[PDB]
Swiss-Prot record:
This is Thiol-disulfide oxidoreductase ResA. Disulfide bonds join 37-40. The keyword Transmembrane helix applies. It comes from the Bacteria. The chain holds residues 38 to 174 of 179 of the full protein. Belongs to the thioredoxin family. ResA subfamily. Its main location: membrane. GO terms for cellular component: plasma membrane. GO terms for molecular function: antioxidant activity; disulfide oxidoreductase activity. Residues 1-137 form the Thioredoxin domain. It is a single-pass type II membrane protein. It is found in: Cell membrane.
Amino acid sequence: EGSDAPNFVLEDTNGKRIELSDLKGKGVFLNFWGTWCEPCKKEFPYMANQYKHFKSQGVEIVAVNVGESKIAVHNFMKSYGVNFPVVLDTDRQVLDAYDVSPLPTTFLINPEGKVVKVVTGTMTESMIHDYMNLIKP
């Protein structure tokens, strides 16, 4: 069932604009994070490993960075082996549209574009696997 996921358009660290509604038809694992955030750091390698399994099953990750710069985010991506889309919520407009407080917070969006599950806090690799299975087409 779910609720409609608020649409947004944000850049990646190359300046490419990504619009959430353009990912309809795929599951979207929408993860809010910051470079300073320890529970975020812990789960990033798990996300990358699971993405290897689920990209070919029609799950996309969109990891929304809260407020930091292209260079800070680039450096983090390289350090953590990020192999999936990362966008920059430069002014917290997307954070606020999702009503996110602590980091990380994750929204599991089905192929219809509806939020079916919300997860606050760090996620184990087993949990991430389950979450991606939930939203795959």
